[PDB]
Amino acid sequence: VLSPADKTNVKAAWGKVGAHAGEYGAEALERMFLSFPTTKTYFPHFDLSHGSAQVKGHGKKVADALTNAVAHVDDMPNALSALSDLHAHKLRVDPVNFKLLSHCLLVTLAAHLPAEFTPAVHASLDKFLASVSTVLTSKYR
Amino acid sequence: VLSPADKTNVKAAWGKVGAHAGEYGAEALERMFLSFPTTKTYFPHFDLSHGSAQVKGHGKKVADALTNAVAHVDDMPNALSALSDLHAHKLRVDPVNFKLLSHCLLVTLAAHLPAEFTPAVHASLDKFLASVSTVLTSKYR
Amino acid sequence: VHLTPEEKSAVTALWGKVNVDEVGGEALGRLLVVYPWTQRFFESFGDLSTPDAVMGNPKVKAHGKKVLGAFSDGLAHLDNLKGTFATLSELHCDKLHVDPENFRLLGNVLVCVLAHHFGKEFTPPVQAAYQKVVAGVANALAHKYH
Amino acid sequence: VHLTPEEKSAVTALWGKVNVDEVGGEALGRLLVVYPWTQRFFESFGDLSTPDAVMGNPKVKAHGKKVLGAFSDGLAHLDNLKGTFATLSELHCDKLHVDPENFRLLGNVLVCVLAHHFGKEFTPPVQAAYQKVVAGVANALAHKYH
Numbered sequence: 001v002l003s004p005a006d007k008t009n010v011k012a013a014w015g016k017v018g019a020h021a022g023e024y025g026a027e028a029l030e031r032m033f034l035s036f037p038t039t040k041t042y043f044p045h046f047d048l049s050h051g052s053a054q055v056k057g058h059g060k061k062v063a064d065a066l067t068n069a070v071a072h073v074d075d076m077p078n079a080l081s082a083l084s085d086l087h088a089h090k091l092r093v094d095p096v097n098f099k100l101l102s103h104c105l106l107v108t109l110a111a112h113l114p115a116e117f118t119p120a121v122h123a124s125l126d127k128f129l130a131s132v133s134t135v136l137t138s139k140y141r
Numbered sequence: 142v143l144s145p146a147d148k149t150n151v152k153a154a155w156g157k158v159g160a161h162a163g164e165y166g167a168e169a170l171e172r173m174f175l176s177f178p179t180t181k182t183y184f185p186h187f188d189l190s191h192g193s194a195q196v197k198g199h200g201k202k203v204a205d206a207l208t209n210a211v212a213h214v215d216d217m218p219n220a221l222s223a224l225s226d227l228h229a230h231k232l233r234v235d236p237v238n239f240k241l242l243s244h245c246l247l248v249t250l251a252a253h254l255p256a257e258f259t260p261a262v263h264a265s266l267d268k269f270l271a272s273v274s275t276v277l278t279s280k281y282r
Numbered sequence: 283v284h285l286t287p288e289e290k291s292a293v294t295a296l297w298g299k300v301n302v303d304e305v306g307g308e309a310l311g312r313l314l315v316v317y318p319w320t321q322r323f324f325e326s327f328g329d330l331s332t333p334d335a336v337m338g339n340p341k342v343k344a345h346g347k348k349v350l351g352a353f354s355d356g357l358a359h360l361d362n363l364k365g366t367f368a369t370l371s372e373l374h375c376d377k378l379h380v381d382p383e384n385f386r387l388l389g390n391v392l393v394c395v396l397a398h399h400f401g402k403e404f405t406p407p408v409q410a411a412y413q414k415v416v417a418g419v420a421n422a423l424a425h426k427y428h
Numbered sequence: 429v430h431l432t433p434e435e436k437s438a439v440t441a442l443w444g445k446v447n448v449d450e451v452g453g454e455a456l457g458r459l460l461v462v463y464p465w466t467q468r469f470f471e472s473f474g475d476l477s478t479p480d481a482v483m484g485n486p487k488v489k490a491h492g493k494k495v496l497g498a499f500s501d502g503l504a505h506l507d508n509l510k511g512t513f514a515t516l517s518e519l520h521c522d523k524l525h526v527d528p529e530n531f532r533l534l535g536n537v538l539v540c541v542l543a544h545h546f547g548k549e550f551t552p553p554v555q556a557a558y559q560k561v562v563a564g565v566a567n568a569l570a571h572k573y574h
């Protein structure tokens with residue numbers, strides 16, 4: 001579970017991302033499509049090239065859920081229940097892929113937040129996301 | 142969450158295992174040291190020889206914990222002279238090996254219980270041991 | 283991958299009793315049951331509601347047969363596997379959009395179908411050999427994803 | 429694993445500005461802090477509870493340098509990785525008994541330290557070349573495990 005200090009480091013780090021959140025979104029994705037080619041098997045309908053507006057718009061939506069998530073850190077299973085049903089039932093996206101996004105997302109934060117991304121914050125951030133990933137796979141079976 | 146049709150599946154499967162529990166635990170273990178050679182990195186102090194009285198003595202404990210889990214299907218940990226939070230802190234076993242033990246402990250049951258191993262009781266057994274690995278890896282960080 | 287002669291013959295000999303139509307079908311159907319999300323490819327098949335109609339669907343059986351068959355070819359190319367399925371790794375990828383985890387998934391339920399088929403004969407040394415096959419085979423089939 | 433003429437250049441060129449001593453103890457330290465179960469191979473270093481203590485632990489630092497040191501010398505021979513690491517693979521398995529999944533966790537932490545270090549200079553195409561490489565070194569240290 002996230003310790004109280006974890007919950008503080010996550011909100012402290014996200015607060016600093018700010019208006020750039022949806023910006024970092026598309027970047028975590030591009031890094032994912034490019035680093036782990038396998039991840040783009042779920043996007044036959046998306047122009048995945050760089051510059052792409054679809055890869056940008058989506059990143060904004062990925063940013064929004066982690067913001068709603070940070071907002072409801074003590075109640076993620078209820079605030080992300082909607083998406084969990086969307087990924088497992090309607091998308092059926094294999095659980096080993098979220099571990100893949102969370103890594104690119106984390107690298108993307110190590111690239112823009114060098115002051116804040118200390119070893120302590122890094123760890124709390126690897127937790128927060130693992131907990132998100134978990135919630136998103138709750139409804140697979 | 143294990144559905145109610147799951148709990149009753151898991152229960153009948155293990156009750157049928159009866160006294161054979163320890164016999165089975167030890168078998169899944171040796172199957173694991175053979176198929177997945179990396180798991181041996183955690184038992185370099187165990188007599189890993191064929192017919193070893195240290196693995197059979199270890200398969201017993203593992204089964205005794207799996208029977209206790211089943212017999213308190215609303216709560217998964219705590220058992221023997223040191224579990225409770227034994228793995229997370231003392232052993233520190235990488236979460237990745239928990240899925241390997243569950244696989245091998247399922248092929249054991251698919252081998253000896255071919256009649257109760259319908260492709261529905263297999264799904265419950267799978268969701269069960271996944272819920273146990275999830276509980277044992279619960280307080281890791 | 284290289285296989286210890288007797289560990290290579292445990293594969294060779296056991297395969298010869300495998301009813302590829304019963305094990306092929308059960309390997310796929312038991313996969314569509316256990317890891318639910320794997321149906322994102324099998325929607326054309328039809329009725330996959332309860333694990334019942336999943337297992338009994340004549341499409342699931344039908345496709346598990348040609349899935350096991352191709353496996354039953356790499357069993358000869360037990361040296362260079364890549365230069366065999368590399369063709370199918372293009373397909374399953376570019377055209378078919380299949381996530382490689384599902385192959386890794388197949389190999390494990392298959393290991394269980396065989397043990398559900400040979401019970402006692404499926405000893406640990408034999409399973410272990412059959413693991414060296416399935417993992418390596420899974421990676422050959424997912425070698426050049428771009 | 430495979431790489432390409434242009435990817436090698438990005439790897440090699442981004443490795444020149446790397447301070448192996450620094451990043452070595454920066455990566456192993458952040459590994460021991462994000463995945464504290466890896467501390468099972470380090471009772472013989474000292475205080476490893478608080479992150480302050482892990483990072484500035486002179487013994488962590490001394491060993492980070494050794495690892496990344498021997499990591500660095502592996503980039504040179506990027507066409508024959510499994511060979512180059514055959515003797516460290518056998519030493520980690522037999523002698524040290526180090527679960528190979530530690531190498532993958534360390535590779536992921538090493539990529540974050542390299543993004544944390546180069547900022548924008550560590551673009552998406554640099555991460556993808558670096559992921560390939562760190563996955564490459566991990567399969568190479570794990571090859572001699574039995």
Ligand code: HEM
Pocket residue numbers: 039040042043045061062063065066083086087091093097098099101102132133136
């Ligand atoms: C780490 C957790 C993730 C977050 C925060 C996230 C969030 C979301 C959100 C907010 C949507 C928008 C749904 C809508 O309104 O249409 C969505 C859609 C989707 N997600 Fe996830 N997701 C996550 C991980 C994944 C991963 C790893 C993949 C697969 C590589 C993925 C694949 C999809 C797909 C394919 C869509 C549908 C896009 C479309 O066709 O319009 N998601 N996700």
Ligand code: HEM
Pocket residue numbers: 180183184202203204206207220221222223224227228232234238239240242243273274277
């Ligand atoms: C998910 C299934 C697991 C269960 C139910 C389980 C069960 C047990 C039990 C009951 C004990 C003995 C407690 C005691 O002696 O105080 C124990 C100890 C231990 N477990 Fe686990 N375990 C599991 C997974 C793992 C995994 C996956 C590994 C690694 C491959 C592992 C490695 C160990 C080791 C080394 C010991 C200590 C034995 C000794 O040296 O005394 N366990 N486990």
Ligand code: HEM
Pocket residue numbers: 320323324348349350352353370373374378380384385386388420423
């Ligand atoms: C590792 C064993 C496998 C082998 C050797 C194999 C073999 C085949 C072959 C030969 C084709 C059919 C002919 C064609 O489309 O041109 C095919 C297609 C396909 N495979 Fe696989 N496959 C395997 C595993 C997978 C996995 C793990 C999945 C399951 C999620 C899968 C899903 C599909 C789908 C949906 C198609 C497209 C429909 C079609 O068959 O035409 N395959 N496979």
Ligand code: HEM
Pocket residue numbers: 459466469491494495496498499516519520524526530531534565569
């Ligand atoms: C991918 C990079 C890795 C390389 C190239 C590597 C390299 C080395 C080297 C050169 C040594 C010295 C062995 C000797 O004295 O002959 C060593 C020792 C050791 N390694 Fe690894 N290693 C790597 C990853 C790891 C990881 C991931 C851990 C665990 C977090 C680790 C744990 C050990 C242990 C327990 C020792 C001895 C520690 C000491 O006495 O200072 N290594 N490693």
